[PDB]
Structure 1
Amino acid sequence: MRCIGISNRDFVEGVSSWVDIVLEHGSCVTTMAKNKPTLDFELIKTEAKQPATLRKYCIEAKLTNTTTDSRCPTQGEPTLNEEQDKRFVCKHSMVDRGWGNGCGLFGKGGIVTCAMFTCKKNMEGKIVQPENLEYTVVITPHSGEEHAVGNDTGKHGKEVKITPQSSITEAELTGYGTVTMECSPRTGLDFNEMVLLQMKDKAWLVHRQWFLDLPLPWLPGAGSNWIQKETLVTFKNPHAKKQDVVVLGSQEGAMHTALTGATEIQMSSGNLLFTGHLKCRLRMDKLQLKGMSYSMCTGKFKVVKEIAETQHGTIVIRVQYEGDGSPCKIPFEIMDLEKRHVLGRLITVNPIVTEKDSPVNIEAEPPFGDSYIIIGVEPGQLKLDWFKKG
């Protein structure tokens, strides 16, 4: 009864067997099948089991251990062994030389300045495969338990992992039997032309060329010497006196700007927010209603909570049984105004009392306008008035 409360809910009625449903983060589905239990379905997680790094980008660097080799006007070209260390970034320039700084001659002497580049912070691009993602789905049967209604905690339901690969999941719905699932990872957005870009806790789904065209230092998906370090390094020699080098500073904020609200996916508890869909097929044949032998409850009920309408025109009520028959079925029927002609269906099918002092929640779909909610049988049979919106 977890979908109750939730606006993006979806009512799906089975046949007489198989049922089709579509799940997506934030959406919920309630299935109905006749002679079968009502079930709530919700996609709770999407896990990537160690994908792949297309590339890694440095977004914040260091610049240290600066060295330099400067020749005299005559002495020719500068040389630093650092010019081979691929961790260093270098650049040649000329500077004035003369008696004043160690040369017999006067003129431009060459220089070469190098500095070790070090990455402080980075982001990674990953290649995603629905097929290979692992999905976690929660099934919560409409048992009517005193605390079932919209309980976002998971103890009222079974958690199922749908391995695109490994395949076809089966489920133990305690006291109700077994159900089966066979889903298909759906989605618009072509995925093999997209990339999961992670920056700490955040992460979007970008295109491939856009990601690869990124003007930043990088390491192969497969550190070993960053590539294109100059993108973040600058050399300066304004007055032909000496040459300085400097980094550019975190491109973190810069990146976010470029990712302006793109397909973000970032983080539902250090976890993924799957982009689109999950079409499934459910088979209930191995499932069965609970308590179809039970006696009709003959005692009277008392409204413990209060008929409250859901965003979809259904009503939810919580009653308490004070009779002496438990376990027993709850006499529930929705009638019209001339008291005779049933006008509404139960969503929480086959309502039953399990314990004297344990309330029972029931969701029903009353007709539009004026109706009656008759709980129990006379004696003190409850007759509640209801008017439906619109």
Structure 2
Amino acid sequence: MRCVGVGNRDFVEGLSGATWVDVVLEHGGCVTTMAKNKPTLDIELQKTEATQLATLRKLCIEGKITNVTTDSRCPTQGEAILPEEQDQNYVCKHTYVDRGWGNGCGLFGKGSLVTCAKFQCLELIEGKVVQHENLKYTVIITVHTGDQHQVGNETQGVTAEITPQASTVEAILPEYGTLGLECSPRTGLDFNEMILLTMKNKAWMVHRQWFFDLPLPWTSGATTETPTWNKKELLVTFKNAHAKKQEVVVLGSQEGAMHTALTGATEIQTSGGTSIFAGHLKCRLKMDKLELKGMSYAMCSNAFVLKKEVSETQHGTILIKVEYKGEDAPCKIPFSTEDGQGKAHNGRLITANPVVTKKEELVNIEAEPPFGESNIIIGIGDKALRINWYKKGSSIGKMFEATARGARRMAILGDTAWDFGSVGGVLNSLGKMVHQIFGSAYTALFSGVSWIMKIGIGVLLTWIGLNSKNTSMSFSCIVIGIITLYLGAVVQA
């Protein structure tokens, strides 16, 4: 939705051939696609919502206990039995207590005792898996037209629905042609192995095999009037006291403990129909049909005026707000970036065709300036408005920043990050394959390791590598330890 200053905009430039670029869309941040002689676009995945949810298992968190019973036997006579043990509603445990002539038993010793009490859960947690083919990926696509109001405006764009039923969708941009989206909704987040529990008005996305390993009593989740709770012994606690009688009490509301146990699990919106944020999509952008607006217009013959001071985005990109004081309203904005002490055209536009649409309307021109001091000219002739700017940093700075950004992208996305901005490529595909193999091998080893334990194992691996005489083993241990330290320091985003 035309995000500028989001800090995660991830510029993507270039086209492989047949005019398409492969990009990966994530909830946090955009992608900015600026090809030659095509309108630039600031695309992102806005929200993913599951239309219909199937409840698979429902644990419970609170519990009320009623109808406490108790049967006892003399020591030698064996195990005590209540008729209500076979009732699935009741939960109970056998204990051994001492009996005697004061307890009514004729023979001294330790006698068996079982005390069965009713059980029902006041509140429940309601895990409900998502069918992977009832999703709805909503990609919002702005046009980056240089309008007056859209600088960071999050309500302006074109909406395209991406579902596994109809993945390829041509989003008709207004006056810019029809962009072609060939997407892959089936390879995002693997919702098959996720359960998406709901708690109470606060849902979360949880990995499938963990919700099956919660020490809470479950149900079938069959929307039945009277449920049959399994493993009810987890809530109710049976205290044998001084080994003379057994008393049963409920352990209490597990809401806080469950909230604690959900740390590291991405949250999710559940207002109205569920809407899954914090997801990624792999839409491939086919820009065959994207035309420009003003390719048929003329050049402006009059001057420009700055209406808001220029500012630098976190990614080094300047933004310019000019107003055209001239009579030929449909026009083009001449834009040359004069370098310091030389007229070298080193800075390039990020708005494909800076166009003034009306005399009254303002226009936002986005442009990447050179890393040095660089003037910028917005007009024609000697009365041309000249913006002076000093972008700070070095090209080595951008290289380091891009390397760190790509390392993070590979950390969250994994093998899929190799396909971000990947215009075709054959070496890139081989890198993706080898990364797939190594990432699967690493994920098998380091699954379920903590924030700090990953760093500890990485330090241990590095120390082992430094002190390994075998050159191959030493190099392997050092290399894997460094990346383990990185993953430990970036995990739990």
Q: TM-score, normalised by structure 2?
A: 0.68
Q: Is 2:336 the counterpart of 1:333?
A: yes
Question: Residues 142-179 of structure 1: CA distance to partner in whole angstroms, max 9, x if unpaired?
Answer: 11111101112x2x201222112332112121121211
Structure 2 CA distance for aligned equivalents of residues 312 and 239 of structure 1: 70
Structure 2 residue runs without a partner (length 5+): 394-493
Taking a change above 3 Å as real, the CA distance of residues 139 and 190 of structure 1, as seen in their structure-2 partners, is closer
Does the 8 Å CA contact 1:41/1:137 hold for their aligned counterparts? Answer: yes
Does the 8 Å CA contact 1:300/1:377 hold for their aligned counterparts? Answer: yes
Question: What is the one-letter code of the residue matched to 1:123?
Answer: I
- In structure 2, the residue matched to 1:211 is 211
Percent identity over the alignment is 62
The structure in which a higher percent of residues are helix is 2
Q: What is the deviation of 1:218?
A: 0.7
Number of residues paired by the alignment? 380
Q: What is the deviation of 1:24?
A: 0.8
Q: Is 2:224 the counterpart of 1:224?
A: no
The worse-fitting range, judged by mean Cα deviation, of 279-288 and 24-33 is 279-288
Structure 1 CA distance for aligned equivalents of residues 345 and 142 of structure 2: 28
Does the 8 Å CA contact 1:3/1:29 hold for their aligned counterparts? Answer: no
Structure 2 CA distance for aligned equivalents of residues 281 and 375 of structure 1: 34
Question: What is the one-letter code of the residue matched to 1:345?
Answer: R
- In structure 2, the residue matched to 1:387 is 390
Of 237, 257, 260 in structure 2, the residue corresponding to residue 257 of structure 1 is 260
- In structure 1, the residue matched to 2:323 is 320
Q: What is the deviation of 1:7?
A: 1.2
Structure 2 CA distance for aligned equivalents of residues 78 and 311 of structure 1: 73
Does the 8 Å CA contact 1:95/1:111 hold for their aligned counterparts? Answer: no
Of 376, 393, 396 in structure 2, the residue corresponding to residue 373 of structure 1 is 376
**Partner SS state of residue 267, structure 2:** coil
- In structure 1, the residue matched to 2:278 is 274
Structure 2 CA distance for aligned equivalents of residues 186 and 83 of structure 1: 47
Question: Residues 170-220 of structure 1: CA distance to partner in whole angstroms, max 9, x if unpaired?
Answer: 212112121111222487977655544443314242351x43232221112
- In structure 1, the residue matched to 2:345 is 342
- In structure 1, the residue matched to 2:37 is 35
Question: What is the one-letter code of the residue matched to 1:219?
Answer: T
Structure 2 CA distance for aligned equivalents of residues 85 and 163 of structure 1: 46
Does the 8 Å CA contact 1:7/1:311 hold for their aligned counterparts? Answer: yes
Does the 8 Å CA contact 1:3/1:30 hold for their aligned counterparts? Answer: no
Q: What is the deviation of 1:59?
A: 1.9
Question: What is the one-letter code of the residue matched to 1:205?
Answer: V
**Partner SS state of residue 230, structure 1:** helix
The structure in which a higher percent of residues are strand is 1
**Partner SS state of residue 257, structure 1:** helix
Question: Residues 106-149 of structure 1: CA distance to partner in whole angstroms, max 9, x if unpaired?
Answer: 67998754332111222244445656532111111111111101
Q: What is the deviation of 1:45?
A: 1.0
Q: What is the deviation of 1:32?
A: 1.2
Taking a change above 3 Å as real, the CA distance of residues 190 and 42 of structure 1, as seen in their structure-2 partners, is closer
Name the Cα RMSD after superposition.
3.2
**Partner SS state of residue 306, structure 1:** strand
Q: Is 2:292 the counterpart of 1:293?
A: no
Does the 8 Å CA contact 1:299/1:325 hold for their aligned counterparts? Answer: no
1:86-97 to 2 correspondences below 5 Å: 86-91=88-93
1:1-390 to 2 correspondences below 5 Å: 2-15=2-15, 17-67=19-69, 82-91=84-93, 113-128=115-130, 132-152=134-154, 154=155, 156-185=156-185, 193-200=193-200, 201-208=202-209, 210-222=210-222, 223-238=226-241, 243-261=246-264, 264-268=265-269, 270=271, 271-275=275-279, 277-338=280-341, 340-378=343-381, 380-390=383-393
**Partner SS state of residue 166, structure 2:** coil
Question: What is the one-letter code of the residue matched to 1:278?
Answer: L
**Partner SS state of residue 115, structure 1:** strand
**Partner SS state of residue 124, structure 2:** strand
Q: What is the deviation of 1:82?
A: 4.3
The worse-fitting range, judged by mean Cα deviation, of 355-364 and 339-348 is 339-348
Question: What is the one-letter code of the residue matched to 1:138?
Answer: I
Q: What is the deviation of 1:96?
A: 5.8
Structure 1 CA distance for aligned equivalents of residues 44 and 189 of structure 2: 22
Structure 1 CA distance for aligned equivalents of residues 326 and 37 of structure 2: 26
Q: What is the deviation of 1:21?
A: 1.2
**Partner SS state of residue 304, structure 1:** strand
Q: What is the deviation of 1:318?
A: 0.2
Structure 1 residue runs without a partner (length 5+): none
Taking a change above 3 Å as real, the CA distance of residues 126 and 268 of structure 1, as seen in their structure-2 partners, is closer
Q: TM-score, normalised by structure 1?
A: 0.84
